[PDB]
Amino acid sequence: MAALTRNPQFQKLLEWHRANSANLKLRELFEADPERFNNFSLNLNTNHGHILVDYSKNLVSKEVMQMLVELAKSRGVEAARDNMFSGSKINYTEDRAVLHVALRNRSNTPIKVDGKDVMPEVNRVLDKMKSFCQRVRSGDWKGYTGKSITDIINIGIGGSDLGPLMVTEALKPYSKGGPRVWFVSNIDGTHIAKTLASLSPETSLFIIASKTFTTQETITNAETAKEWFLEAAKDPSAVAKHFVALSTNTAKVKEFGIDPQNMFEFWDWVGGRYSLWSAIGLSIALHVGFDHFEQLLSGAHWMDQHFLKTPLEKNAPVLLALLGIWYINCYGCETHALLPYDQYMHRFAAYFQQGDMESNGKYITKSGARVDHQTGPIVWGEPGTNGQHAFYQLIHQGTKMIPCDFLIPVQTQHPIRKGLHHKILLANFLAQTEALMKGKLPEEARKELQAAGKSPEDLEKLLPHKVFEGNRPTNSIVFTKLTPFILGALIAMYEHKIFVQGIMWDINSFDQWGVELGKQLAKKIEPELEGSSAVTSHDSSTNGLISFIKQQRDTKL
Amino acid sequence: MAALTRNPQFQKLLEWHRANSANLKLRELFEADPERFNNFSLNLNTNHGHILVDYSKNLVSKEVMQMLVELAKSRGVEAARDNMFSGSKINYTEDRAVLHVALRNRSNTPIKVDGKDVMPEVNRVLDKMKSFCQRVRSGDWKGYTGKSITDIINIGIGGSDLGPLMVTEALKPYSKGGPRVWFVSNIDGTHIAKTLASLSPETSLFIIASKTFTTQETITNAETAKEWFLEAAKDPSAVAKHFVALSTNTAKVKEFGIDPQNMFEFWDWVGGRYSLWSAIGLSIALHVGFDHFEQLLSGAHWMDQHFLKTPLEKNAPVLLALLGIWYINCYGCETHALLPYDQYMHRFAAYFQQGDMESNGKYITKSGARVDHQTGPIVWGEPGTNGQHAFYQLIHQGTKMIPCDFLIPVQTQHPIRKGLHHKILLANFLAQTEALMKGKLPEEARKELQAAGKSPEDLEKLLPHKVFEGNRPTNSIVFTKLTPFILGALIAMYEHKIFVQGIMWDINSFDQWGVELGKQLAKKIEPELEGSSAVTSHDSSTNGLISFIKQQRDTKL
Ligand SMILES: O=C(O)[C@H](O)[C@@H](O)[C@H](O)[C@H](O)COP(=O)(O)O
Ligand SMILES: O=C(O)[C@H](O)[C@@H](O)[C@H](O)[C@H](O)COP(=O)(O)O
């Protein structure tokens, strides 16, 4: 047994679910209570736009929410939160603080690690980033032939890739006057090859993004970039004009051959999947300008303050977390879908697929005991409206329960045709959650079949296929506009959702020991692939696949 | 109850699972039997490359596979397949044939629908596509000001978008000397707006891809494109040089104002999510050339013939389907991950997320019974190695069982640094499935921590976190090279896997009444967004969300 399952508030919740959950029907919940939306939503005013978190289309009553809040309290969420914010070493397996909140601490109130305020160094690096952004964006920073930089290439993977990629994509309209940004991440040589093919060494600046500065994919990609660069420049001293580093590892940055003044530092208490707020966000700041980067940080700071100050029962990330606990630990739902009705947000789901799954895909608790309950869900999704044509069939008429978060800005960045496209986009956003809740009754579908001129036989056969059970719960998250500030608040909101769930499960949201085995085994296989000799050192499958590779790699097609 | 659960071969399978599955341990299965790879893999020689389907790292024995094959026979898979290939109207809810196999029927053996061979019309459209491709790609086809076409823009959604998108991405190296290709799909105005900003009306050719030619997103996007075009051209006759249609609806194509000689026809028996093989594939053929499109079709034809003629026990799509049934209906796994170790394949998982989930996300059977068992899984994934740094933490050390298909070409399109990148990519591909299979025992992790220099205290604290339980099953699908032919074979293989699972569940893989519902939903909300008036006609959530939209849409940020 584990902390969560031994908790009496959890036991009460589970027993309530067993006895009563069959009585929960969304249609009836709304019919019984005209104040339902009012009581089961949060309209947050940030002073820079509103964020409406509408959780009313969920399979919860007032009683269920009360039990969930009581569980958050009795799992120590409030104390755990305060410990994060104060610099306690809550990443217990690595003995590190967890301080992405410090990166965006706009108030500059001291946050101490080992008795020392981290804010001076946070701000020093931010100042460095700002200066660098001015130099590059103005054209003052020259390439080896004296030309202004037109292209920036981030080289990094996972935490050193997805954040900057997702954010630059989401904030594309804010990039006027900024250099083009490219993201190279996969070791697959296709990635760097196709990127370099469209670039000039004279006007391209590479950003080597790596906490450790030892990740194989990133260092290999970086060395490939440098080789390509030096082929043209034929001068090792020119590297300082075209390569900068975002890292915690001064020594390995120097060994690679980058100028010490070209290093933008971060700290061990910045987790990779929580790092876009640090030096790692340099490509964001370059692309959209430092002012917009500061706005992004400020939005996160607003949400941090909301999370810190707000009673749990009306605390947005807490409520989202609690709904997830309900669906995961009581209903047994494996997945959570993120469905932004926004093309600019097209990498948002992929970002939180990392942020969520790498954080909470854990099975060992703080005491060292194995969990005897579910932890993190599989996170997935694609932007609306496309999903409606693609996998919503399964959401509407399959055999899985799938909690979905639908997200949309009220105002579009592109109000073409006098807002026609956005009107339609909004209408779909609204209609889909409504339909997921309501479904379609036999009496409704029957009349439709009759009106279509179906024979009595055809109607009878078709009817069950046209009926939708509904009762599919959703969150609707609606915000004034997707500005840098609002985007920052939204990312931070989900960061804190993930944190609350982790605390409740008694797991460490901030380590990632599960990547180690794959890395070890790959290092062993790498040298074995070279040459013609048979590999027999593994299981028959691994050996068999290697044999196939060696046999097939010289075939001409 | 339903056909599957009433089936005695299924109940035998399930009973065996209950009694025996806990005793299946992958590490031990491989140690006990050096022939395991040999007995649980298929090395397919297509004469244009090999496809190795290695299913040996699955939680199966000879006996499990025997029971699964017997179940497939009991469920009448072979007869159902033959019926699909013969043009029987197996899409029973829409009374339609299901004949994507006819689209790529290179043999030209007659396939009849309603007594009439479909092949002459299939080939007539293919010939038209070929002629059009030559004219555009050669530069002969001129725009309204007399310039060659430089950009092609597919406008379509769902089945009319994702296939052409995924395939042109996957076959990018084959696009030298072809026009740039763009995909516009979302109604979100951002999609068309950002596309048009990069284009000239003089040199852009639009492809309106829509089976019905009534889909709201597509027709709206098309009308927006046409307005933009006509603002520049100022001549309705110029539309014929810049707009073509891929459709079954001649009348609606004419209504939109497209030249009848600019219409590339397909048929009702071509499902949208099975349509890239038809006229819908025109953007593929324009981008990579008709010869490469023909190779794509040929590869699918090879796999069709494999599916049609091979005994079930050695039939690749059947075996993949059966392994899925094992994990879905016996283990209860909600999801299936597709993990291609290939950047060009970056939209492959998204494509089959649609192909699989829209096909098999169903709950009514052929008999009209509601299923009392699971149907289609949630399909998801991202290319390796990035996934290793995003969500593999959860796959390795979470609380979910997740069947994964790992896919890779032996030969890379970009053998940079003398093959160094691809070597590392292959090493990771192999290591990850080995790691998922093997895990790491407490005693193995203990020895590692001891050797690392950890104190008895630090070791004990860290130990449980370093343990990998393993026993996580995978498929490895390795192919000589990702050519058009091999890609075609791989897509068809998964199409047929989906088909087999559908037959076994007794559902219609080929309708989409949930998607049809969708296309009926937003029309009611649309007029309610106009004006400042409060909406009280829906449930309080829909009402409240509409109120928020109206309150927030004029705010200046
Ligand atoms: O924080 C994380 O999400 C993980 O630790 C991981 O995804 C990490 O970010 C990458 O492996 C890049 O690591 P480096 O920044 O050290 O190159
Ligand atoms: O076949 C499918 O998978 C679905 O029917 C759906 O995804 C369809 O492709 C789109 O709604 C576009 O429909 P049109 O091609 O008619 O515009």
Side-chain angles (χ1 to χ4, degrees), chain A residues 157-160 209-213 215 218 271-273 354 358 512, chain B residues 389:
Chain A
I157 197 160
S160 289
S210 186
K211 191 168 177 192
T212 54
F213 227 77
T215 300
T218 300
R273 60 188 169 276
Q354 171 169 21
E358 199 173 65
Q512 55 287 309
Chain B
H389 308 254

PDB file of all heavy atoms in Angstrom, chain A residues 157-160 209-213 215 218 271-273 354 358 512, chain B residues 389, ligand 1:
ATOM      1  N   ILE A 157      17.291  18.679 -27.435  1.00  0.00           N
ATOM      2  CA  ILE A 157      16.274  17.630 -27.463  1.00  0.00           C
ATOM      3  C   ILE A 157      15.473  17.619 -26.158  1.00  0.00           C
ATOM      4  O   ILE A 157      15.973  18.066 -25.123  1.00  0.00           O
ATOM      5  CB  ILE A 157      16.922  16.248 -27.786  1.00  0.00           C
ATOM      6  CG1 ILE A 157      15.863  15.228 -28.237  1.00  0.00           C
ATOM      7  CG2 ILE A 157      17.777  15.743 -26.614  1.00  0.00           C
ATOM      8  CD1 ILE A 157      16.424  14.040 -29.021  1.00  0.00           C
ATOM      9  N   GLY A 158      14.229  17.137 -26.227  1.00  0.00           N
ATOM     10  CA  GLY A 158      13.353  17.064 -25.064  1.00  0.00           C
ATOM     11  C   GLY A 158      13.148  18.423 -24.413  1.00  0.00           C
ATOM     12  O   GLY A 158      12.658  19.357 -25.047  1.00  0.00           O
ATOM     13  N   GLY A 159      13.540  18.537 -23.147  1.00  0.00           N
ATOM     14  CA  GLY A 159      13.436  19.792 -22.419  1.00  0.00           C
ATOM     15  C   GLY A 159      14.161  20.977 -23.045  1.00  0.00           C
ATOM     16  O   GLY A 159      13.799  22.130 -22.813  1.00  0.00           O
ATOM     17  N   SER A 160      15.182  20.695 -23.845  1.00  0.00           N
ATOM     18  CA  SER A 160      15.959  21.749 -24.491  1.00  0.00           C
ATOM     19  C   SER A 160      15.475  22.031 -25.921  1.00  0.00           C
ATOM     20  O   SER A 160      16.135  22.746 -26.683  1.00  0.00           O
ATOM     21  CB  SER A 160      17.447  21.382 -24.469  1.00  0.00           C
ATOM     22  OG  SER A 160      17.966  21.466 -23.147  1.00  0.00           O
ATOM     23  N   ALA A 209      21.565  24.060 -27.009  1.00  0.00           N
ATOM     24  CA  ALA A 209      20.751  24.065 -25.797  1.00  0.00           C
ATOM     25  C   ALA A 209      20.890  22.733 -25.080  1.00  0.00           C
ATOM     26  O   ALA A 209      20.388  21.714 -25.550  1.00  0.00           O
ATOM     27  CB  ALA A 209      19.285  24.344 -26.141  1.00  0.00           C
ATOM     28  N   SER A 210      21.597  22.733 -23.952  1.00  0.00           N
ATOM     29  CA  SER A 210      21.809  21.492 -23.206  1.00  0.00           C
ATOM     30  C   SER A 210      22.202  21.755 -21.760  1.00  0.00           C
ATOM     31  O   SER A 210      23.267  22.299 -21.501  1.00  0.00           O
ATOM     32  CB  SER A 210      22.881  20.635 -23.890  1.00  0.00           C
ATOM     33  OG  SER A 210      23.001  19.367 -23.257  1.00  0.00           O
ATOM     34  N   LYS A 211      21.335  21.356 -20.830  1.00  0.00           N
ATOM     35  CA  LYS A 211      21.611  21.457 -19.395  1.00  0.00           C
ATOM     36  C   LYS A 211      22.953  20.811 -19.060  1.00  0.00           C
ATOM     37  O   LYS A 211      23.844  21.465 -18.510  1.00  0.00           O
ATOM     38  CB  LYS A 211      20.482  20.803 -18.585  1.00  0.00           C
ATOM     39  CG  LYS A 211      20.535  21.093 -17.082  1.00  0.00           C
ATOM     40  CD  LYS A 211      19.254  20.663 -16.375  1.00  0.00           C
ATOM     41  CE  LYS A 211      19.359  20.890 -14.876  1.00  0.00           C
ATOM     42  NZ  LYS A 211      18.253  20.229 -14.117  1.00  0.00           N
ATOM     43  N   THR A 212      23.090  19.539 -19.420  1.00  0.00           N
ATOM     44  CA  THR A 212      24.299  18.761 -19.130  1.00  0.00           C
ATOM     45  C   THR A 212      25.436  19.084 -20.088  1.00  0.00           C
ATOM     46  O   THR A 212      26.608  18.955 -19.731  1.00  0.00           O
ATOM     47  CB  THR A 212      24.013  17.248 -19.217  1.00  0.00           C
ATOM     48  OG1 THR A 212      23.434  16.935 -20.497  1.00  0.00           O
ATOM     49  CG2 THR A 212      22.950  16.829 -18.212  1.00  0.00           C
ATOM     50  N   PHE A 213      25.078  19.494 -21.304  1.00  0.00           N
ATOM     51  CA  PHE A 213      26.019  19.589 -22.427  1.00  0.00           C
ATOM     52  C   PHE A 213      26.743  18.269 -22.727  1.00  0.00           C
ATOM     53  O   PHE A 213      27.898  18.278 -23.167  1.00  0.00           O
ATOM     54  CB  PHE A 213      27.011  20.744 -22.238  1.00  0.00           C
ATOM     55  CG  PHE A 213      27.167  21.611 -23.455  1.00  0.00           C
ATOM     56  CD1 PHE A 213      26.193  22.548 -23.787  1.00  0.00           C
ATOM     57  CD2 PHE A 213      28.287  21.495 -24.269  1.00  0.00           C
ATOM     58  CE1 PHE A 213      26.333  23.356 -24.915  1.00  0.00           C
ATOM     59  CE2 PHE A 213      28.437  22.299 -25.403  1.00  0.00           C
ATOM     60  CZ  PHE A 213      27.459  23.232 -25.724  1.00  0.00           C
ATOM     61  N   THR A 215      24.388  15.322 -23.668  1.00  0.00           N
ATOM     62  CA  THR A 215      23.376  14.536 -24.375  1.00  0.00           C
ATOM     63  C   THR A 215      23.870  14.207 -25.772  1.00  0.00           C
ATOM     64  O   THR A 215      24.232  15.108 -26.538  1.00  0.00           O
ATOM     65  CB  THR A 215      22.040  15.306 -24.446  1.00  0.00           C
ATOM     66  OG1 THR A 215      21.587  15.580 -23.120  1.00  0.00           O
ATOM     67  CG2 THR A 215      20.932  14.423 -25.018  1.00  0.00           C
ATOM     68  N   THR A 218      22.262  15.889 -29.028  1.00  0.00           N
ATOM     69  CA  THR A 218      22.560  17.313 -29.100  1.00  0.00           C
ATOM     70  C   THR A 218      24.014  17.610 -29.434  1.00  0.00           C
ATOM     71  O   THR A 218      24.288  18.442 -30.297  1.00  0.00           O
ATOM     72  CB  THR A 218      22.152  17.991 -27.788  1.00  0.00           C
ATOM     73  OG1 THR A 218      20.742  17.808 -27.592  1.00  0.00           O
ATOM     74  CG2 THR A 218      22.329  19.500 -27.873  1.00  0.00           C
ATOM     75  N   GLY A 271      14.343  22.096 -14.058  1.00  0.00           N
ATOM     76  CA  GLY A 271      14.120  20.847 -14.763  1.00  0.00           C
ATOM     77  C   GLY A 271      13.998  21.129 -16.251  1.00  0.00           C
ATOM     78  O   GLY A 271      13.496  22.190 -16.636  1.00  0.00           O
ATOM     79  N   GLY A 272      14.468  20.199 -17.079  1.00  0.00           N
ATOM     80  CA  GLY A 272      14.476  20.391 -18.527  1.00  0.00           C
ATOM     81  C   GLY A 272      13.093  20.695 -19.072  1.00  0.00           C
ATOM     82  O   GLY A 272      12.904  21.641 -19.841  1.00  0.00           O
ATOM     83  N   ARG A 273      12.112  19.899 -18.652  1.00  0.00           N
ATOM     84  CA  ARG A 273      10.735  20.089 -19.097  1.00  0.00           C
ATOM     85  C   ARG A 273      10.043  21.274 -18.415  1.00  0.00           C
ATOM     86  O   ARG A 273       8.853  21.512 -18.643  1.00  0.00           O
ATOM     87  CB  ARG A 273       9.926  18.792 -18.929  1.00  0.00           C
ATOM     88  CG  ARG A 273       9.839  18.289 -17.499  1.00  0.00           C
ATOM     89  CD  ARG A 273       9.202  16.905 -17.375  1.00  0.00           C
ATOM     90  NE  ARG A 273       9.385  16.377 -16.025  1.00  0.00           N
ATOM     91  CZ  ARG A 273      10.470  15.731 -15.605  1.00  0.00           C
ATOM     92  NH1 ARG A 273      11.485  15.508 -16.431  1.00  0.00           N
ATOM     93  NH2 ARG A 273      10.537  15.305 -14.347  1.00  0.00           N
ATOM     94  N   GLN A 354       5.117  15.699 -22.934  1.00  0.00           N
ATOM     95  CA  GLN A 354       6.350  15.638 -22.139  1.00  0.00           C
ATOM     96  C   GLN A 354       6.159  16.142 -20.700  1.00  0.00           C
ATOM     97  O   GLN A 354       6.499  15.436 -19.746  1.00  0.00           O
ATOM     98  CB  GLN A 354       7.521  16.378 -22.808  1.00  0.00           C
ATOM     99  CG  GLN A 354       8.737  16.503 -21.883  1.00  0.00           C
ATOM    100  CD  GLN A 354      10.013  16.986 -22.554  1.00  0.00           C
ATOM    101  OE1 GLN A 354       9.979  17.607 -23.613  1.00  0.00           O
ATOM    102  NE2 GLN A 354      11.145  16.696 -21.926  1.00  0.00           N
ATOM    103  N   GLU A 358       6.456  12.763 -18.537  1.00  0.00           N
ATOM    104  CA  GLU A 358       7.796  12.599 -17.982  1.00  0.00           C
ATOM    105  C   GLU A 358       7.833  12.953 -16.494  1.00  0.00           C
ATOM    106  O   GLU A 358       8.634  12.390 -15.744  1.00  0.00           O
ATOM    107  CB  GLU A 358       8.824  13.415 -18.753  1.00  0.00           C
ATOM    108  CG  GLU A 358      10.247  12.931 -18.531  1.00  0.00           C
ATOM    109  CD  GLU A 358      11.219  13.637 -19.432  1.00  0.00           C
ATOM    110  OE1 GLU A 358      11.379  14.857 -19.273  1.00  0.00           O
ATOM    111  OE2 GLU A 358      11.796  12.975 -20.313  1.00  0.00           O
ATOM    112  N   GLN A 512      13.699  11.925 -13.475  1.00  0.00           N
ATOM    113  CA  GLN A 512      13.370  11.128 -14.662  1.00  0.00           C
ATOM    114  C   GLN A 512      14.339   9.953 -14.816  1.00  0.00           C
ATOM    115  O   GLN A 512      15.072   9.848 -15.802  1.00  0.00           O
ATOM    116  CB  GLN A 512      13.290  11.994 -15.942  1.00  0.00           C
ATOM    117  CG  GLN A 512      14.516  12.852 -16.266  1.00  0.00           C
ATOM    118  CD  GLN A 512      14.676  14.049 -15.353  1.00  0.00           C
ATOM    119  OE1 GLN A 512      13.736  14.828 -15.155  1.00  0.00           O
ATOM    120  NE2 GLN A 512      15.866  14.192 -14.776  1.00  0.00           N
TER     121      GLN A 512
ATOM    122  N   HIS B 389      12.983  11.344 -24.872  1.00  0.00           N
ATOM    123  CA  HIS B 389      13.203  12.515 -24.031  1.00  0.00           C
ATOM    124  C   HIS B 389      11.902  13.252 -23.747  1.00  0.00           C
ATOM    125  O   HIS B 389      11.925  14.362 -23.207  1.00  0.00           O
ATOM    126  CB  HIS B 389      14.169  13.488 -24.714  1.00  0.00           C
ATOM    127  CG  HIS B 389      15.446  12.854 -25.162  1.00  0.00           C
ATOM    128  ND1 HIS B 389      16.643  13.051 -24.506  1.00  0.00           N
ATOM    129  CD2 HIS B 389      15.714  12.023 -26.194  1.00  0.00           C
ATOM    130  CE1 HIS B 389      17.593  12.367 -25.118  1.00  0.00           C
ATOM    131  NE2 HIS B 389      17.055  11.732 -26.142  1.00  0.00           N
TER     132      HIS B 389
HETATM  133  O1  LIG C   1      13.932  17.508 -18.138  1.00  0.00           O
HETATM  134  C1  LIG C   1      13.625  16.665 -18.958  1.00  0.00           C
HETATM  135  O2  LIG C   1      12.464  16.787 -19.581  1.00  0.00           O
HETATM  136  C2  LIG C   1      14.528  15.494 -19.249  1.00  0.00           C
HETATM  137  O3  LIG C   1      15.633  15.529 -18.351  1.00  0.00           O
HETATM  138  C3  LIG C   1      14.990  15.457 -20.722  1.00  0.00           C
HETATM  139  O4  LIG C   1      13.904  15.645 -21.628  1.00  0.00           O
HETATM  140  C4  LIG C   1      16.095  16.452 -21.069  1.00  0.00           C
HETATM  141  O5  LIG C   1      15.554  17.763 -21.096  1.00  0.00           O
HETATM  142  C5  LIG C   1      16.738  16.159 -22.430  1.00  0.00           C
HETATM  143  O6  LIG C   1      17.377  14.886 -22.453  1.00  0.00           O
HETATM  144  C6  LIG C   1      17.779  17.222 -22.759  1.00  0.00           C
HETATM  145  O7  LIG C   1      18.801  17.190 -21.763  1.00  0.00           O
HETATM  146  P1  LIG C   1      19.991  18.267 -21.812  1.00  0.00           P
HETATM  147  O8  LIG C   1      19.365  19.723 -21.716  1.00  0.00           O
HETATM  148  O9  LIG C   1      20.985  17.985 -20.607  1.00  0.00           O
HETATM  149  O10 LIG C   1      20.774  18.119 -23.181  1.00  0.00           O
END
